[PDB]
Amino acid sequence: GAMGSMERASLIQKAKLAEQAERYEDMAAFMKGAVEKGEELSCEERNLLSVAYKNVVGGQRAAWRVLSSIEQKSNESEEKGPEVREYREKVETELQGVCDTVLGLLDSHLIKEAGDAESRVFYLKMKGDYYRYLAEVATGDDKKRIIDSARSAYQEAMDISKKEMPPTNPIRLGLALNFSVFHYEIANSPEEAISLAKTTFDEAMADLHTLSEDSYKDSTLIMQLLRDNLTLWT
Amino acid sequence: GAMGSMERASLIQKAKLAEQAERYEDMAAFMKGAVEKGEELSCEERNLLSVAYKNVVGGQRAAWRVLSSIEQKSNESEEKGPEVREYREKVETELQGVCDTVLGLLDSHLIKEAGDAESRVFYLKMKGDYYRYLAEVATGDDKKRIIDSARSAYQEAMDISKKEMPPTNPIRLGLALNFSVFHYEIANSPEEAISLAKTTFDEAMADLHTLSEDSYKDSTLIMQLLRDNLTLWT
Amino acid sequence: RSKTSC
Amino acid sequence: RSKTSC
Ligand SMILES: [Ca+2]
Ligand SMILES: [Ca+2]
Ligand SMILES: [Cl-]
Ligand SMILES: [Cl-]
Ligand code: NA
Ligand code: NA
Ligand code: NA
Ligand code: NA
Ligand code: NA
Ligand code: NA
Ligand code: NA
Ligand code: NA
Ligand code: NA
Ligand code: NA
Numbered sequence: 136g137a138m139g140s141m142e143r144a145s146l147i148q149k150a151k152l153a154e155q156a157e158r159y160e161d162m163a164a165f166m167k168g169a170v171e172k173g174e175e176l177s178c179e180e181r182n183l184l185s186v187a188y189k190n191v192v193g194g195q196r197a198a199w200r201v202l203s204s205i206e207q208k209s210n211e212s213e214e215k216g217p218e219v220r221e222y223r224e225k226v227e228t229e230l231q232g233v234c235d236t237v238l239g240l241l242d243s244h245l246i247k248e249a250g251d252a253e254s255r256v257f258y259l260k261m262k263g264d265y266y267r268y269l270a271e272v273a274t275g276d277d278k279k280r281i282i283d284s285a286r287s288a289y290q291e292a293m294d295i296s297k298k299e300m301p302p303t304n305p306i307r308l309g310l311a312l313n314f315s316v317f318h319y320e321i322a323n324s325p326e327e328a329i330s331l332a333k334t335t336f337d338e339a340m341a342d343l344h345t346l347s348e349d350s351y352k353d354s355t356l357i358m359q360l361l362r363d364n365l366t367l368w369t
Numbered sequence: 370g371a372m373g374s375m376e377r378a379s380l381i382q383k384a385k386l387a388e389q390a391e392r393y394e395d396m397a398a399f400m401k402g403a404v405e406k407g408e409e410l411s412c413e414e415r416n417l418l419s420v421a422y423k424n425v426v427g428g429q430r431a432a433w434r435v436l437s438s439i440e441q442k443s444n445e446s447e448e449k450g451p452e453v454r455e456y457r458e459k460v461e462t463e464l465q466g467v468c469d470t471v472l473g474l475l476d477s478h479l480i481k482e483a484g485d486a487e488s489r490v491f492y493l494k495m496k497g498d499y500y501r502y503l504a505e506v507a508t509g510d511d512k513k514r515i516i517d518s519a520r521s522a523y524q525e526a527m528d529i530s531k532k533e534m535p536p537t538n539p540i541r542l543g544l545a546l547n548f549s550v551f552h553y554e555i556a557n558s559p560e561e562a563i564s565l566a567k568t569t570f571d572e573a574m575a576d577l578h579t580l581s582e583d584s585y586k587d588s589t590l591i592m593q594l595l596r597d598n599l600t601l602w603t
Numbered sequence: 604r605s606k607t608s609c
Numbered sequence: 610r611s612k613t614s615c
Binding site for chain 2: 145148149152153155156157158161194197198201202205215216218219221222225226
Binding site: 264309310312319320360363364367368 | 609
């Protein structure tokens with residue numbers, strides 16, 4: 136790896152600088168380098184890893200959707216050759232590579248070394264997320280296996296989070312948010328999506344009274360995202 | 370070049386797709402490939418080239434400014450090691466490489482083949498712009514030579530534009546806008562900057578009566594940028 | 604678009 | 610910031 140010669144602490148420092156500069160590809164490469172040092176990640180470091188790759192793949196997903204839309208309309212229309220498909224495939228391949236890179240870090244060896252609920256649920260949610268992004272562009276022999284890999288990762292994260300975390304825990308809340316979107320957008324299960332979002336929201340609401348002002352603000356922010364989706368879906 | 374096997378028309382088509390997807394690095398590489406086919410560029414193609422690299426270097430410049438600010442404050446303050454300087458240098462080197470790439474395309478062989486005023490002024494303005502971006506990060510033996518290269522390119526573009534184009538021509542207007550910013554920001558000549566912006570604005574104002582509604586809208590848009598700068602500078 | 608975690 | 614051509 137090109138980051139093999141840089142100190143772990145320097146990689147983390149530069150990841151934070153890249154975030155300030157909105158240089159998310161750099162941020163991701165720095166955090167990949169930090170993971171490959173082989174030590175477990177702190178809570179702050181896990182969030183840096185997640186922020187970096189979320190922004191990178193977020194840009195690719197947005198680009199893929201633009202190009203897929205153009206491609207779909209070309210198939211309704213004058214023939215303009217292979218270029219739209221070719222370029223959509225280029226972006227798609229780059230997106231799949233980023234997802235594969237993240238899943239590779241989780242499998243070698245973040246998940247197996249993660250024993251606390253807060254780290255294990257975090258990494259399993261990430262595994263579900265990046266299989267979900269693969270599922271968004273999948274159209275082949277393994278779309279179903281990709282979907283089941285996302286579901287399986289989310290399900291394991293859910294089981295742990297329900298046993299080990301309070302209903303207002305932001306990681307638990309963000310996991311349930313994303314699993315409900317998986318149900319609605321990927322798994323063709325809108326009723327499951329709605330049920331999970333409601334139940335998650337209501338159980339968090341009943342636990343808010345236990346929280347500090349600052350934790351209350353953290354939890355209600357994510358609860359509002361559940362509410363926004365319920366309003367869109369119903 | 371990795372674009373050597375792709376048709377010129379396909380590169381142009383994909384540049385337009387990348388723009389729609391906000392994939393400006395891809396856009397720039399496609400347009401670099403198109404230039405290297407060796408044929409002159411149409412007006413629309415010149416604008417694609419300019420849009421692509423402007424967005425790429427624009428992101429690098431914004432990142433460089435964030436990091437330079439952090440570096441300047443570190444030099445006022447607890448010692449945190451070489452990482453800020455190192456990463457600022459990384460971004461700086463990548464920015465200089467993009468500028469060098471653009472200047473290389475202009476020198477091999479866009480400018481020498483450009484005979485019409487609209488193309489020659491366009492390319493010379495671009496040469497001034499990318500030397501100006503080099504000047505923004507220069508701090509060495511050749512900061513002065515870089516500044517004089519920007520000035521010389523802008524000056525040649527100005528001389529042609531005044532002889533060959535009307536005062537409302539958007540290329541002429543955008544050239545004068547950027548040369549005035551060169552004077553204010555790079556050359557420590559705010560009075561020259563103000564004089565050029567005013568004169569440019571006033572001469573365009575007196576020529577608006579000759580224009581269609583659509584050309585009037587094109588010219589007044591750029592005249593407003595001159596006005597915005599005069600308001601900031603005075 | 605459905606919202607996912609920030 | 611001074612504005613340059615779009
Ligand atoms: Ca452990
Ligand atoms: Ca010619
Ligand atoms: Cl392509
Ligand atoms: Cl670096
Ligand atoms: Na070390
Ligand atoms: Na370890
Ligand atoms: Na075509
Ligand atoms: Na617990
Ligand atoms: Na509704
Ligand atoms: Na050809
Ligand atoms: Na030629
Ligand atoms: Na340090
Ligand atoms: Na003329
Ligand atoms: Na003023």
